[PDB]
């Protein structure tokens, strides 16, 4: 197989979804995650992740502390192939500036990243989480939050997310 | 308690009506921030498509 | 020693059409002119990457496929990529073409997999949390890994 049947769908995937599929992204992605677990058990340590982060991206002790908290949903410690995976499509090269607007479209659900706990309601939390993870003005975020929360509650509901993705990724492209 | 009660409610009453009216002036200028909006991106679209069609 | 196949690495693997043989070729007597007229590194770069855009900017009405490539080259960042691409596949073909495959290549591989048994070994094995050797050696397995990368 080429590279299980799984990756292969999600690589068809991720083709459909961007203008550009790259060449052995995926493969490259797991010859760094291969490096990184010295035990080869599908699991890197906090520490080789922080490592990783810090050659790669040159992130924060804490920012890399708070996304390995965020990917690693199970608390076991440990980040497995799969979220690393995941961890670098979600980057995919942050710097540039289609990045944006690739992040914008998120994933196929694109509420389960932001929603850290799993509610179906972001909060104050997540928000500031996610502006740590993509670099944004502090007004700008709240004036965002302002505006999705129409009822007040400070809660955002799946269909409103969705409906805020939709309308910026529409002012984007217009 | 007389004077009391009046004082409370007449407040009350006095400061009910204030927050229904800046809620009421909040509710009109979201309304009128989302038309801005609608009007924004049907000109848009509208050049787009005349861009679309004279090229 | 890139030790890989010259069949499979001159298969045209250019998307254009263009002979990747052709082109080593014509870099190579690029390259030797360069040589006999004592070039300067930047004016020989700055040569290459003009050869390769010109290789990329055939006749535009023959596929827009070599419209996007010019595209693609006329920007910075993406046609630095794409040359660097270009250079390495360039050379690993001319050192395969006479003979490539020689000794140290299997040294290398014995290397590499004791490194890797080692480093799943410490991974494996960690009794202190707090220790400073195994610490150590995983920051030394893991800045090997990322200056490899």
């Not at chain 1, 799969?82 to 990045?99: G, K, S, T």
């Not at chain 3, 007229?37 to 055939?58: D, F, K, M, S, V």
């Not at chain 3, 299997?106 to 480093?119: F, G, N, R």
């Not at chain 3, 494996?124 to 707090?130: A, E, K, Q």
Request: glycine content about 4%; proline content about 2%.
């Amino acid at each position: 197989m080429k590279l299980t049947p799984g990756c292969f769908l999600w690589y068809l995937y991720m083709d459909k979804i961007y203008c550009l599929l790259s060449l052995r992204n995926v493969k490259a992605l797991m010859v760094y995650f291969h490096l990184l677990d010295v035990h080869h058990r599908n699991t890197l340590n906090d520490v080789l992740f922080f490592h990783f982060l810090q050659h790669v991206t040159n992130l924060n002790k804490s920012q890399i502390g708070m996304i390995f908290d965020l990917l690693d949903w199970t608390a076991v410690g440990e980040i497995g192939f799969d979220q690393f995976y995941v961890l670098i499509c979600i980057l995919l090269a942050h710097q540039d500036h289609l990045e944006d607007h690739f992040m914008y479209r998120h994933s196929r659900p694109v509420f389960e990243l932001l929603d850290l706990d799993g509610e179906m309601n972001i909060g104050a939390a997540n928000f500031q989480n996610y502006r740590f993870l993509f670099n944004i003005k502090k007004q700008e975020l709240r004036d965002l939050f302002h505006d999705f929360d129409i009822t007040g509650d400070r809660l955002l509901n799946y269909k409103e997310f969705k409906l805020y993705t939709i309308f910026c990724t529409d002012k984007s492209i217009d | 308690n007389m004077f009391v009660g009046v004082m409370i409610m007449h407040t009350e009453d006095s400061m009910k009506k204030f927050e229904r009216d800046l809620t009421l002036e909040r509710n009109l200028a979201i309304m009128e921030e989302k038309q801005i909006i609608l009007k924004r991106q049907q000109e848009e679209v509208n050049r787009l498509m005349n861009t679309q069609k004279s090229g | 020693t890139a030790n890989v196949s010259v069949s499979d690495v001159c298969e045209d693997f250019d998307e254009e059409g263009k002979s990747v043989r052709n082109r080593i070729r014509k870099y190579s007597q690029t390259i030797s002119i360069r040589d006999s007229l004592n070039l300067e590194p930047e004016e020989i770069q700055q040569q290459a990457r003009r050869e390769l855009e010109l290789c990329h900017g055939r006749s535009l009405e023959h596929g827009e496929d070599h419209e996007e490539s010019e595209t693609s080259l006329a920007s910075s960042t993406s046609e630095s990529l794409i040359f660097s691409l270009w250079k390495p596949h360039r050379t690993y073909w001319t050192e395969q073409q006479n003979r490539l495959p020689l000794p140290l290549m299997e040294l290398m591989e014995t290397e590499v997999l004791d490194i890797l048994k080692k480093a799943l070994i410490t991974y494996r094995s960690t009794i202190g949390r707090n220790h400073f050797m195994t610490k150590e050696l995983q920051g030394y397995i893991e800045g090997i890994r990322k200056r490899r990368n």
